[PDB]
Design an enzyme around this catalytic site. Sequence first.
Site, PDB file in Angstrom:
ATOM      1  N   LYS A  47      -0.347   0.403  -8.532  1.00 49.01           N
ATOM      2  CA  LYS A  47       0.162   0.870  -7.223  1.00 49.01           C
ATOM      3  C   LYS A  47      -0.756   0.285  -6.141  1.00 49.01           C
ATOM      4  O   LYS A  47      -2.020   0.291  -6.281  1.00 49.01           O
ATOM      5  CB  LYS A  47       0.156   2.388  -7.169  1.00 49.01           C
ATOM      6  CG  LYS A  47       1.042   2.966  -8.315  1.00 49.01           C
ATOM      7  CD  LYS A  47       1.205   4.500  -8.373  1.00 49.01           C
ATOM      8  CE  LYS A  47       2.597   4.920  -7.936  1.00 49.01           C
ATOM      9  NZ  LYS A  47       3.623   4.185  -8.760  1.00 49.01           N
ATOM     10  N   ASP A 107       3.218  -2.325  -7.502  1.00 44.94           N
ATOM     11  CA  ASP A 107       4.268  -1.472  -6.973  1.00 44.94           C
ATOM     12  C   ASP A 107       3.743  -0.875  -5.650  1.00 44.94           C
ATOM     13  O   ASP A 107       2.700  -0.219  -5.612  1.00 44.94           O
ATOM     14  CB  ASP A 107       4.606  -0.339  -7.961  1.00 44.94           C
ATOM     15  CG  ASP A 107       5.688   0.617  -7.423  1.00 44.94           C
ATOM     16  OD1 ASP A 107       6.239   0.425  -6.291  1.00 44.94           O
ATOM     17  OD2 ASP A 107       5.982   1.592  -8.149  1.00 44.94           O
ATOM     18  N   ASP A 146      13.882  -1.577  -6.850  1.00 46.03           N
ATOM     19  CA  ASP A 146      14.167  -0.453  -7.731  1.00 46.03           C
ATOM     20  C   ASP A 146      15.185   0.388  -7.021  1.00 46.03           C
ATOM     21  O   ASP A 146      16.408   0.168  -7.180  1.00 46.03           O
ATOM     22  CB  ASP A 146      12.865   0.303  -8.037  1.00 46.03           C
ATOM     23  CG  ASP A 146      13.125   1.663  -8.732  1.00 46.03           C
ATOM     24  OD1 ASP A 146      14.150   1.736  -9.413  1.00 46.03           O
ATOM     25  OD2 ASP A 146      12.304   2.605  -8.639  1.00 46.03           O
ATOM     26  N   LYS A 190      17.819   0.890 -14.297  1.00 44.69           N
ATOM     27  CA  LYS A 190      17.977   2.171 -14.983  1.00 44.69           C
ATOM     28  C   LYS A 190      19.466   2.326 -15.251  1.00 44.69           C
ATOM     29  O   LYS A 190      20.266   2.514 -14.337  1.00 44.69           O
ATOM     30  CB  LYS A 190      17.429   3.309 -14.118  1.00 44.69           C
ATOM     31  CG  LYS A 190      15.852   3.143 -13.787  1.00 44.69           C
ATOM     32  CD  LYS A 190      15.282   4.165 -12.844  1.00 44.69           C
ATOM     33  CE  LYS A 190      13.781   4.057 -12.866  1.00 44.69           C
ATOM     34  NZ  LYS A 190      13.404   2.926 -12.023  1.00 44.69           N
ATOM     35  N   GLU A 221       6.910  -4.863  -6.515  1.00 43.81           N
ATOM     36  CA  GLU A 221       8.049  -3.933  -6.421  1.00 43.81           C
ATOM     37  C   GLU A 221       8.142  -3.105  -5.075  1.00 43.81           C
ATOM     38  O   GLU A 221       7.122  -2.616  -4.611  1.00 43.81           O
ATOM     39  CB  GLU A 221       7.960  -2.984  -7.614  1.00 43.81           C
ATOM     40  CG  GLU A 221       9.101  -2.061  -7.719  1.00 43.81           C
ATOM     41  CD  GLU A 221       9.014  -1.208  -9.007  1.00 43.81           C
ATOM     42  OE1 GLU A 221       7.964  -1.182  -9.707  1.00 43.81           O
ATOM     43  OE2 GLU A 221      10.020  -0.613  -9.367  1.00 43.81           O
TER      44      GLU A 221
END
Lengths: 374, 383
Positions: free
Chosen positions: A166, A191, A241, A265, A216
Amino acid sequence: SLQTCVLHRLSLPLKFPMRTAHGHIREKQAILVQLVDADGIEGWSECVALAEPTYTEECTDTAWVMLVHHLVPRFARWLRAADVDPRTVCEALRDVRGNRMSVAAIEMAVWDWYAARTGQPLVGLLGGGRDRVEVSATLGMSESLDVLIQSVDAAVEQGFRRVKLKIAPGRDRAAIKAVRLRYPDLAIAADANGSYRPEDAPVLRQLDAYDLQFIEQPLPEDDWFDLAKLQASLRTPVCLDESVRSVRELKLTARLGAARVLNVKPGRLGGFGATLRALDVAGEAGMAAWVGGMYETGVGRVHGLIAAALPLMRYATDLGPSDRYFEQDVLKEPIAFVEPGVIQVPQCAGVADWVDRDAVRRFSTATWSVDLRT
Amino acid sequence: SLQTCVLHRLSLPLKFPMRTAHGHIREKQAILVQLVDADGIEGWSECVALAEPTYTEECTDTAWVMLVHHLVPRFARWLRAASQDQDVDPRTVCEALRDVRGNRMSVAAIEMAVWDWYAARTGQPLVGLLGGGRDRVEVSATLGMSESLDVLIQSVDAAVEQGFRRVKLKIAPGRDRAAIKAVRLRYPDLAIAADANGSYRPEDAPVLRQLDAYDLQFIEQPLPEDDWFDLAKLQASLRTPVCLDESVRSVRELKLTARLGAARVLNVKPGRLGGFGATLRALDVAGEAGMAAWVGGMYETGVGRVHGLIAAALPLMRYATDLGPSDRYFEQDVLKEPIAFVEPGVIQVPQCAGVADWVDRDAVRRFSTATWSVDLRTLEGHH
């Protein structure tokens, strides 16, 4: 000859309760769908909606009534109009806007059943060639660089093949430099959780030196034109995402060149057919993808790992072993590493024979079923 | 301070069956939000989610549980925060819900009941509170499609005879040019709009372009919610403005619409957008972009219809509203006095300091299929 749909609402204690804004999440609430045909053959799936609508708009409570009062009746009506093709199931649900995780629960249970019915590995029916998948570990930020380094050390020492750090303004280059200094050969992704702005282009570009797999969500959700300009100026792939909810936002991404990698997902996309369609769009655009997680019970974990076998799923999955989430899960044998940092793609012909039914009974808080012929 | 929230789930009989998608239905389900403070001062609002998730992703069932188990608890928590100690500012109430994704019609019901309570508490007209200047608004009529061009023209005449200042014709491929041509010839000066309900595809662009000859005010929702670039290309090819309703659920989607040149007119429904504050933000962005806006309908009870007419008073609301008189829809509505034309085709903008005084408690009670109340200070409720 599908005859029965049974919805199971479950609460499983989380091994590692997660921090929220005003407290903590200690239980995974999940909804399992169980489909049974006239001969007793079953297919199961998991609705991945979370307990609170903090990550997407669906949550367990609203998913439950959406299935009970809207999607299951629609599915029954569609069944009563002529063997069943799992590729056409979403036709029953034509007119429903959004609710893709509730829709995915039905559509994936039908594929799982059809694998069971035909005795063919589900992964093989979907076209998944990969036999094993690499797994990533996610590392939170730390004010201390030594603490961040220790967390990377511990991950690498547990086998992990990728780490995902992160990052945020003022808390990016120092960390990534120190990690890449220590592990010249490790796969590292980052991310950003939407913490950057278009002015930060030069800072992100600075990170090109570290050969990150992707960055991300650099910018706020829906900064589409700003994102396309930012990606044009970076060699590192941007990964999206939550910015890509549907195959549509994916086509928008492709047309603008706004990103090159997707966190897929399958439940959020609306099921296996929708995942296959997304990978088609992505592949034509020269994008690639990986499967992210939603702290699934083992049913959803199995289906996610199967999706991770699909050809375009070239980067490590966030789906780890069951024991990183739950002391006790819903499968007879927990999902575990087969090699350090690597999980065997499930070769089951449907997950049903792998479900621990005593464990589903024990964790259940509510059950509801209906005869699909009625 | 605010002490109790009561949610009412209503089922209202319709004068005749309304068009679903592929069906008809007898009764309108609705959710009203009622807030009450320690002095007995009240705010009401309507959650506009429809019974099925066929227009947006919210429906009555899911909005009810979202309100009970998620939003009302969050709102109680916020009410007990020190910063709400002396004044509750309706401008900031969405911050209680800032961590919720989507669910904008449920969110809007909270936000709008707080605006409504605030007007009643301060005895100020809700419309002046939001900057709504217009004193009256003109009203449109929606006409269904028929394979009989006679039925159609008869429906148009009937609407016109009644004073409606716009007609909006339902159109689809193969049943578009003929209806519109006929209506335009017969009514050279009438505002005519068209609603495609997503029935066209990019290959149908030549047909839609033939429609530019008739000077429609807009063509609503020509394409599915499938691809933003198909929409941008279609609008670039059409002289007629495209209007979006369900394709625009947030101020950020409106930003993207404007950036793409994907549409030129916005159907505003405060509930779909997330409430009054969201509606004001949308109008800012639409005005900056050169877009026109108007207020659409959701077969609202009197509460929602009153709030929707107050939004239609806002300055950029330049076209007619779809929100017509109560009686077109219900034998008996939830107001003591039905919403009616002040002159044919025109409705007076509500000047109420809140709608509470206008609510027929007996009607609300008769139409109730469920009722949930909660002490806002503790969080104990019951059925």
